[PDB]
Ligand binder design. Sequence first.
Ligand SMILES: *[C@@H]1O[C@H](CO)[C@@H](O)[C@H](O)[C@H]1NC(C)=O
Ligand SMILES: *[C@@H]1O[C@H](CO)[C@@H](O)[C@H](O)[C@H]1NC(C)=O
Ligand SMILES: *[C@@H]1O[C@H](CO)[C@@H](O)[C@H](O)[C@H]1NC(C)=O
Ligand SMILES: *[C@H]1O[C@H](CO)[C@@H](O)[C@H](O)[C@H]1NC(C)=O
Ligand SMILES: *[C@H]1O[C@H](CO)[C@@H](O)[C@H](O)[C@H]1NC(C)=O
Ligand SMILES: [Ca+2]
Ligand SMILES: [Cu+2]
Lengths: 601, 268
Amino acid sequence: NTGNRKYYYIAAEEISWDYSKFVPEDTVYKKVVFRKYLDSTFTKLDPQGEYEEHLGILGPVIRAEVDDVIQVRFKNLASRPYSLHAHGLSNAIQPNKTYTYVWHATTRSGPENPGSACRAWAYYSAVNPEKDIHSGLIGPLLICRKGTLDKETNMPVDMREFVLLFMVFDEKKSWYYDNSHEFHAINGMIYNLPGLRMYEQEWVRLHLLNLGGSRDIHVVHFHGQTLLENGTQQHQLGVWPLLPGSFKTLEMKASKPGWWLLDTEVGEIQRAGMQTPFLIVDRECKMPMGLSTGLIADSQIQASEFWGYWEPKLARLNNGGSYNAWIAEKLSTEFNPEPWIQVDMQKEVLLTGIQTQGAKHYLKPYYTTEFCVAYSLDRKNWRIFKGNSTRNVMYFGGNSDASTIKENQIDPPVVARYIRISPTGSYNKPALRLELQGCEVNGCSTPLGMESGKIENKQITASSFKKSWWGNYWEPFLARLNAQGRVNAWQAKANNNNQWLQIDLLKIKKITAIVTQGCKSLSSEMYVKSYTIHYSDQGTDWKPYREKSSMVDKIFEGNNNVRGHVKNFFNPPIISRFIRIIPKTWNQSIALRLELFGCDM
Amino acid sequence: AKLRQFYVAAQSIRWNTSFKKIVYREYEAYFQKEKPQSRTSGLLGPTLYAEVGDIMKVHFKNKAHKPLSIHAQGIKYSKFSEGASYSDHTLPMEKMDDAVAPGQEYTYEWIISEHSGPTHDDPPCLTHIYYSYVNLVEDFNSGLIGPLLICKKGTLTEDGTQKMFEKQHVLMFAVFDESKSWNQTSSLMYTVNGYVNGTMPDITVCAHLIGMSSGPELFSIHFNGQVLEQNHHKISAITLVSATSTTGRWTIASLIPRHFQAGMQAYI
Ligand SMILES: *[C@@H]1O[C@H](CO)[C@@H](O)[C@H](O)[C@H]1NC(C)=O
Ligand SMILES: *[C@@H]1O[C@H](CO)[C@@H](O)[C@H](O)[C@H]1NC(C)=O
Ligand SMILES: *[C@@H]1O[C@H](CO)[C@@H](O)[C@H](O)[C@H]1NC(C)=O
Ligand SMILES: *[C@H]1O[C@H](CO)[C@@H](O)[C@H](O)[C@H]1NC(C)=O
Ligand SMILES: *[C@H]1O[C@H](CO)[C@@H](O)[C@H](O)[C@H]1NC(C)=O
Ligand SMILES: [Ca+2]
Ligand SMILES: [Cu+2]
């Protein structure tokens, strides 16, 4: 009894298109594409989110369940006649003129009883198919089985869909008007198509569609990955023969972080450009970026304004005090993002989450009840984040009270060096104590076990340790970053120079960094101010970590306070099973709490 | 969960007139000598195989006059075991697996895992292929290429051979074009393991296809014996494309206006 109407207002528009943009020499041609508008007036258009950034030349993804009814209001703002044909239903519209189509997504269009919740088809202008598709009028059309789409039509389950069109656009068949003007592309892009990001060991659904001539034939290859054919039959393919006029869907479970390539692997074509890198993020990428632990310096925080004494340098999760948060006198920020706090990672990183908190003068609560998040790589071009969002942008829900932490996810991971937060709703005044979450873009940068426990106690062993007869024992396996309670760290029985703390990674791992933290117990701030690393593969014999060129051991600067964190990266990673920290300098007493970073090999 | 070993290497070798070409060769122990295979398998390289769980280790020793690599297209490798070069932002320790210089020898380590192998509704052993990525149009054409086979639990032999099936071949309907290779030698050549219209040691019957071609291409291998059973149902013929492999006296031709009318035929 479903028959839900799915409204779409799509127009055909002339634009300039630059293949290669994210990579040739002048590859921009006039083109005509399917653009998504917000309503019948075709005045304001529906901004393209992060979820469909990879779409490139394709139009908005029309989508629908079975028995559903698709009604699209086609405007057509181009100079000549065009049309919107939906290949898979089962007349040339003149410029500046509208016309509503009405398609009934029958069972014949849906997927198969066994696998893949959704099936791929395609829509495009049909006045002159070939000359039109080659001009840029083509888009993905998905048909799912009842219950696959959510209130605001997106896949929740398998989730994470991708729509790649492997095809050659021959500008010699369009607004040519007047050499080989051919582009062996993916979604109309050559060599680099941005927007492809997924999580390690996560199931994504691929919709591969090739609407090109007979000489196309493209063997889509996902490096280091294995495609899966889900249906009344399951087959593990390693590459898939995508033939002309065909549409195919096949899931894939990404494996291992890093930058991998996507190509047609029909050599001659692949080198012409039918390829793009695609990013696989670490499975547990959501670690504190440093606002709440000290890793991010006051220098890196900056706002456009702040209500007297509630300075930006204060917006740190949990930081307590009379003045312990950033507050703006006004959140007048509407079609303006003026009230904002900016965090500069100083380098690009992966942002996958944001946590906010309010402040409390004394008894008067202060907090943000809603905000927006913008990012940039240069600091010049910003992008207001969107994803699920039913509005032009994502309007994250803020806090309810002034102390509880509000957790917010970023639909699809984004790359940024500058995160810009701006309150759009509040109780009294937009106060904010916040923390950003993520990891390194290149992966292999997550914790190894110190703080969780994956690394068990019977793995941490130090030269010496304390045990004062007042019931205070500081065993080595307590040097777990962020420890609390009784004895929360490692105490060096002696504060000399040749003391050591080592961890048994039980196997050879890839060590990319380390985080060190002091300890504030018995009212005495003691911590390791400097160290040196030694690594072993079998157990004995150590090789002092040295720089790209030297013979002296490496001196890593540690912390300068009791609670703060300090991160050190190993330019050339460490490949071993044993790691040793050799305190060289400190304050009052040698104590520790640490965590390592790296991945399996 | 055994471990597999291989010591295949790259080397130039004249080849049926003749041309100077490159091919992958098996080699053994620590690279003492190879045990060629005249019976068909013309330019076709070795034939790498393993089973789910088998942490295989492929040793490569280049001897050609151009840097090359081992690019398996069917395994979940890592950056230092992939075999390709592009901006993946990795460090040199991980870049020295992409290009192996003329005379150097490195070992690709592939941890063929469970969820990276055959399904249950598919053949007992999946067929894939490998080649050198260092240069796609050259390497292949210059004769480089080679079948890879990932099998299921107790389906492969302890001596590297099909189990309860035995005697499976490896036809490689692959058209070459010497114009695009080592030498600027204008010579098209629709083959079947390198061999043209003929001169290919067939094999009578007592009763694993590939289809390279560097450019856009589709091969329609038509067998003359109902021995082609895909899963649980037979098909008259099989179809392949430029880089997609698939898992008595008669002929095996490809009834296509430019394959059967040009010598592509492997007599059963
Ligand atoms: C295969 O399809 C079924 C049916 O929709 C689905 O539940 C399952 O998650 C799919 N398997 C994978 C890993 O894609
Ligand atoms: C290819 O031709 C000869 C082989 O006959 C070879 O010696 C030479 O190096 C090559 N020359 C070309 C065409 O570059
Ligand atoms: C013989 O084979 C060559 C290439 O292998 C081909 O050019 C020629 O046409 C073939 N002869 C015929 C027509 O059988
Ligand atoms: C809208 O486009 C049509 C088609 O060219 C044109 O006739 C009309 O003038 C345009 N609108 C205006 C008045 O700018
Ligand atoms: C994104 O926002 C929340 C988190 O799951 C949820 O309401 C929504 O369904 C998510 N989007 C998708 C694709 O499910
Ligand atoms: Ca590599
Ligand atoms: Cu590839």
